[PDB]
């Protein structure tokens, strides 16, 4: 139903090792479709999903030029950050930015985003109204006044309401076979003895898309939030994802425990138990 497009910029200074490096990636939902690396011998925006390849030379040339311009801008932004924080030119620092649009089920703009960070901490963010900014510290307030004076938020709002939604909707249609068809998880429960008196029950969810999923363990219908070990959702490398949840149970109580799986790909939520004689 809902969909999103996000661009992620990373700019990192490397004093004494070369000029600052700029890396950009673009995502539609959980699918990466473009990349740019200033460290490449011939830097260009490159396809990373099959449905983006149909775009013309005008698209790749325009994207590459914009990425080249952005790399130069963030090279200067890194120097500006040194002034605001009174930092030496010998240290390594990172600026990050993520921006994009969220589309509602009706296919229209639901929310726009534009956030920036310095050394992994919030710096400045565009507010939900797409007209004002929130600055994290006094240095970012210097940037906020410059952006207010230069009417940056109106430029962001025009992009987020217009080109961002238009390009995202185009990608969703061109890649509808993969982007708009959810892959349900393949699920099973495994049992691992820890001792003669205790065992781990592990609930698996494999090969699902998109990444959002809910895995919970229940004991006699009661969620075991505190005692559940939950690993981060992880990529399988084929554009689908994996996750598991585990709980340690007394030997002989295993059948009291149920694993519950919620995913967009499933018609109904799943309820699983250890079934050794499957």
């Amino acid at each position: 139903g809902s969909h999103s497009m996000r661009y992620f910029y990373t700019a990192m200074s490397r004093p004494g090792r070369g000029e600052p490096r700029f890396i950009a990636v673009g995502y539609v939902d959980d699918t990466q479709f473009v990349r740019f690396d200033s460290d490449a011998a011939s830097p260009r925006t490159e396809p990373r999903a099959p449905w983006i390849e149909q775009e013309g030379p005008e698209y790749w040339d325009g994207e590459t030029r914009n990425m080249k311009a952005s790399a130069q801008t963030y090279r200067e932004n890194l120097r500006i950050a040194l002034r605001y924080y009174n930092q030496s030119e010998a240290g390594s620092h990172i600026i990050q930015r993520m921006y994009g649009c969220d589309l509602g089920p009706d296919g229209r703009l639901l929310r726009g985003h534009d956030q920036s960070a310095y050394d992994g901490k919030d710096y400045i963010a565009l507010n939900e109204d797409l007209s004002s900014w929130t600055a994290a510290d006094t240095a970012a307030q210097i940037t906020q006044r410059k952006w207010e004076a230069a009417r940056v938020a109106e430029q962001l709002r025009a992009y987020l309401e217009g080109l961002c939604v238009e390009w995202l909707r185009r990608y969703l249609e061109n890649g509808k076979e993969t982007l708009q068809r959810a892959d349900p998880p393949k699920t099973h429960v495994t049992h691992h003895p820890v001792s003669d008196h205790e065992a781990t029950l592990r609930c698996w969810a494999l090969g699902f898309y998109p990444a959002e999923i809910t895995l919970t363990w229940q004991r006699d219908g009661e969620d075991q939030t505190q005692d559940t070990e939950l690993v981060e959702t992880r990529p399988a490398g084929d554009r689908t994802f994996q996750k598991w949840a585990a709980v340690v149970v007394p030997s002989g109580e295993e059948q009291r425990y149920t694993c519950h799986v919620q995913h967009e790909g499933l018609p109904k939520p799943l309820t699983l138990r250890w079934e050794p004689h499957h």
């Binding site: 992620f8 990373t10 990636v25 990172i94 990050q96 050394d119 992994g120 994996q242 598991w244």
Partner: protein
């Protein structure tokens, strides 16, 4: 701390079947800054020609990367992931467990 130590998961793309082709994954996430060195090991020897995903980051600004290579699992062989990061005093080695 401006610096965040990485989380490490080592796993296969498909359920492990001894003697059958598969992919070995080392997923490093939640780390900052972006500089990191990741290697995949077979009985402690570095596997060559390992590929990795393009650098991206999460909502909390921490980076994540996937390192992978084609492999064939066996009963005897041991696979692992070795990660070095500014936050680590010595490289961290994580054993591949086919049940995880």
């Amino acid at each position: 701390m401006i610096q965040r130590t990485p989380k490490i998961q080592v796993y296969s793309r498909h359920p492990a079947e001894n003697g059958k082709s598969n992919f070995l994954n080392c997923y490093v996430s939640g780390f900052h800054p972006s500089d990191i060195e990741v290697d995949l090991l077979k009985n402690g020897e570095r596997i060559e020609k390992v590929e990795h995903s393009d650098l991206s980051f999460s909502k909390d600004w921490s980076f994540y990367l996937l390192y992978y290579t084609e492999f064939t699992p066996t009963e005897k062989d041991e696979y692992a992931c070795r990660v070095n990061h500014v936050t680590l005093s010595q490289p961290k080695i994580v054993k591949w467990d086919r049940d995880m």
